[PDB]
Amino acid sequence: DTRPRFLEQVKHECHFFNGTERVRFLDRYFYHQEEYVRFDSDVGEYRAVTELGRPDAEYWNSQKDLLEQRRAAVDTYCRHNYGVVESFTVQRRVYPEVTVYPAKTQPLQHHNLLVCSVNGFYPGSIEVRWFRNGQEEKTGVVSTGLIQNGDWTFQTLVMLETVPRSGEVYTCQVEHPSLTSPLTVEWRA
Amino acid sequence: DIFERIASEASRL
Amino acid sequence: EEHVIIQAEFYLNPDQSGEFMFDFDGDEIFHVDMAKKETVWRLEEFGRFASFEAQGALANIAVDKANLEIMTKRSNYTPITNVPPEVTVLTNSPVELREPNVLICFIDKFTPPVVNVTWLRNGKPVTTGVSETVFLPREDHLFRKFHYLPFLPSTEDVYDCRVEHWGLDEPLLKHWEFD
Ligand SMILES: *[C@@H]1O[C@H](CO)[C@@H](O)[C@H](O)[C@H]1NC(C)=O
Ligand SMILES: *[C@@H]1O[C@H](CO)[C@@H](O)[C@H](O)[C@H]1NC(C)=O
């Protein structure tokens, strides 16, 4: 199927700073990926983002009643919907399950990678650090980065390249808004 | 506890 | 900067495919099943704390369809350029033999929002237990999508997520097996 496709998108965005203390409403219109006209509550009128949207800005900006609907949206729409959702979104808190398992950088004889797997947490911001005998190991640390699972949880793997010796204790430490003190998981050779 | 939608603006023909 | 709530909509011709959803910080809160005119909550717990009049979503799609005809003509019928997806296959949690788990197929950075996705086990399509999200919007106005496959990890099975998209020359197959 090679028939040409045509795509319209609209994104009505509500941006919140310090809860509902400062709110910015953005009404954005797109043709394929190209934003062509927008209403910004910082401006109070539509503005063409490309020449494609100049007829819409001119036309909509002539309609004072349309504009007053858009100018009220920070209150009637953004602040309202924040109130509806805030308890299970803004305040959603899911702590991570933390696993440490060994692995290999390449097919080798001995495990030379320690994987700290951090799973199922929300929200996204997290800090994961590796310790050897109580000193932080900053070298040879590599990660998947932050992964969205698409179901309101995140995961990340944080790997430490090391050759483990007997008598060493390795500690993965996880800090996250859902935790009141660092979560630690140890691994011994 | 009711979600509000906002309408999309209609261009002219 | 703290948080962003987006009412995202799209309409696609000639497919006459529409979508209406709400996103919070990159996660879907709900979408409206256009055919059934029903609100579909991404997590069930959401539907006990809030409601949405799904019928109102259809009015937005109708305006979006009308705007699309206008913009299509204004553009001198300039069509979309296909952007093929990046595809990643991962599991929901560390893999343990015989311990139930979920394969996730993450399909990212593509447009238009039309894709065919198949899970394969040992090269054969599997349908039992699978689920998927709608097309999720990106800040660069491309799309992403998730497909899921609950499974029991064994040494005997290999998996693939197979993705077809008009920007791909051949189907994309992303492999997973027990290490
Ligand atoms: C479409 O073509 C007309 C010429 O009839 C031109 O004035 C207009 O700028 C063009 N618009 C595009 C290419 O978006
Ligand atoms: C998906 O499959 C159908 C029929 O199997 C086909 O007509 C359609 O073009 C396919 N879509 C893509 C994006 O490959």
For position A148, which CATH number holds? 2.60.40.10
Please identify among residues 1-13 of chain B the ones whose CB lies closer than 8 Å to any CB of chain C. 1-3, 5-13
Are residues A116 and A69 both part of a single domain? no
Residue A167 token pair = 């008598």
CB C147 within 8 A of CB C102: no
Q: Which ligand is nearest to the CA of C74?
A: 1
| Torsion angle (degrees, nearest 10) of CA A83, A86, A87, A88 | 130
Concatenate the DSSP letters of all residues of C45-87 into one string. Answer: THHHH-B--THHHHHHHHHHHHHHHHHHHHTTS-PPPPBPPEE
Question: Beta-carbon neighbour count of residue A38 at 10 Å?
Answer: 20
> Which amino acid, one-letter code, is at A9?
Q
Measured on CA atoms in the order C116, C122, C128, C129, is the torsion positive or negative?
A: negative
Exposed (0-12), middle (13-18) or buried (19+): which is C10, by Cβ within 10 Å? buried
- C: neighbours with 3+ CB pairs under 8 Å? A, B
The residues of chain C that CATH labels 2.60.40.10 are 80-179
> Which amino acid, one-letter code, is at C141?
H
Are residues A72 and A157 both part of a single domain? no
CA C116 to ligand 2 center in whole angstroms: 6
Residue C9 DSSP code: E
Question: Beta-carbon neighbour count of residue A107 at 10 Å?
Answer: 5
CB C128 within 8 A of CB C25: no
> Which amino acid, one-letter code, is at C57?
A
Residue A105 token pair = 């950088």
Q: Strand pairing of C158-164 and C172-177?
A: antiparallel
Q: Whose CA is nearest to atom 13 of ligand 2?
A: C165
Are residues A80 and A107 both part of a single domain? no
Report the distance separating Cα A9 and Cα C77, nearest Å.
Answer: 16
Q: Whose CA is nearest to atom 1 of ligand 1?
A: C76
Are residues A104 and A54 both part of a single domain? no
Are residues A123 and A96 both part of a single domain? yes
Question: Beta-carbon neighbour count of residue C27 at 10 Å?
Answer: 23
- Does any ligand 1 atom lie closer than 6 A to the CB of residue C76? yes
Method in brief = X-ray
Task: Please provide the CATH number assigned to the domain covering C80-179.
Answer: 2.60.40.10
Domain termination residue (choose one: A55, A75, A90)? A90
CB A101 within 8 A of CB A182: no
Residue A75 token pair = 């209150």
CB C134 within 8 A of CB C147: no
In what helix (H) or strand (E) does residue C120 lie, and over which residues does it extend?
A: strand C116-121
Report the distance separating Cα A74 and Cα C160, nearest Å.
Answer: 46
Q: Which residues partner with C162 through β-bridges?
A: C118, C173
How many structural domains compose chain A? 2
Report the distance separating Cα C133 and Cα C145, nearest Å.
Answer: 6
Alpha helices in A7-115 (DSSP H): 54-61, 64-73, 80-85
Residue B8 DSSP code: P
User: For tokens 């040879």, what's the residue?
Assistant: A140
Q: Whose CA is nearest to atom 4 of ligand 2?
A: C116
Interhelix angle A54-61/A64-73, rounded to 10 degrees, is 100
A40 by DSSP, 3-state: which?
strand
CB A161 within 8 A of CB A105: yes
HSE-CB of C161 using CA atoms within 13 angstroms: 27
Residues contacting C72, CB < 8 A, separation 6+: A6, C13
- Judge if the upstream peptide bond of residue A177 is cis by omega within 30 degrees of 0: no
Q: Which residues of C47-57 are buried (b: 16+ CB within 10 A; e: fewer)?
A: eeebebebebb
A149 by DSSP, 3-state: which?
coil
Are residues A99 and A14 both part of a single domain? no
Residues contacting A36, CB < 8 A, separation 6+: A29, A30, A48, A49, A50, A52, A53, A56, C71
User: For tokens 């090391």, what's the residue?
Assistant: A162
Which of A104, A75, A63 has its CA nearest to residue A14?
A75
Are residues A82 and A97 both part of a single domain? no
Domain termination residue (choose one: A90, A118, A153)? A90
CB A129 within 8 A of CB A139: no
Q: What angle do CA A152, A153, A158 make, to 5 degrees?
A: 155
Instruction: At C50, give phi and psi (nearest 5°).
Output: -155, 165
CB C141 within 8 A of CB A9: yes
Residues contacting A104, CB < 8 A, separation 6+: A110, A111, A112, A113
> Which amino acid, one-letter code, is at C76?
N
Q: Tell me the structure's resolution in angstroms, rounded to a single decimal.
A: 2.1
Residues contacting C44, CB < 8 A, separation 6+: none
Report the distance separating Cα A55 and Cα A61, nearest Å.
Answer: 10
Domain termination residue (choose one: A90, A122, A148)? A90
CB C140 within 8 A of CB C126: no
Report the distance separating Cα C96 and Cα C94, nearest Å.
Answer: 7
For the domain that residue A67 is a member of, what is the CATH number? 3.10.320.10
Are residues A184 and A111 both part of a single domain? yes
Give the residue on B whose Cα is nearest the Cα of A65.
B9
Are residues A121 and A147 both part of a single domain? yes
Instruction: Name chain B contacts of C23, Cβ cutoff 8 Å.
Output: none
HSE-CB of C126 using CA atoms within 13 angstroms: 20
Report the distance separating Cα C70 and Cα C74, nearest Å.
Answer: 6
Instruction: State in words which class domain C1-79 has.
Output: alpha beta
Residue A35 token pair = 């934003």
- A: neighbours with 3+ CB pairs under 8 Å? B, C
Report the distance separating Cα A128 and Cα A138, nearest Å.
Answer: 11
CB C107 within 8 A of CB C144: yes
User: For tokens 């799209």, what's the residue?
Assistant: C10
Phi-psi region of A59 (alpha: psi -120 to 50; beta: other; left: phi over 0): alpha
CA distances from A60 to A69, A98, A108, C7 (A): 11, 53, 67, 20
Q: Which residues partner with A31 through β-bridges?
A: A8, A34
CB A156 within 8 A of CB A144: yes
Phi-psi region of A79 (alpha: psi -120 to 50; beta: other; left: phi over 0): alpha
- Does any ligand 1 atom lie closer than 6 A to the CB of residue C77? no
Residue C87 token pair = 């595809």
Instruction: Name chain B contacts of A78, Cβ cutoff 8 Å.
Output: none
- Judge if the upstream peptide bond of residue C94 is cis by omega within 30 degrees of 0: no
Are residues A139 and A119 both part of a single domain? yes
A71 by DSSP, 3-state: which?
helix
Phi-psi region of A45 (alpha: psi -120 to 50; beta: other; left: phi over 0): beta
Are residues A103 and A83 both part of a single domain? no
CB C7 within 8 A of CB C44: no
For residue A15, give its domain range.
Answer: 1-90
CA A5 to ligand 1 center in whole angstroms: 19
> Which amino acid, one-letter code, is at C170?
E
The residues of chain C that CATH labels 3.10.320.10 are 1-79
Q: What angle do CA C147, C96, C150 make, to 5 degrees?
A: 25
Residue C15 token pair = 């497919």
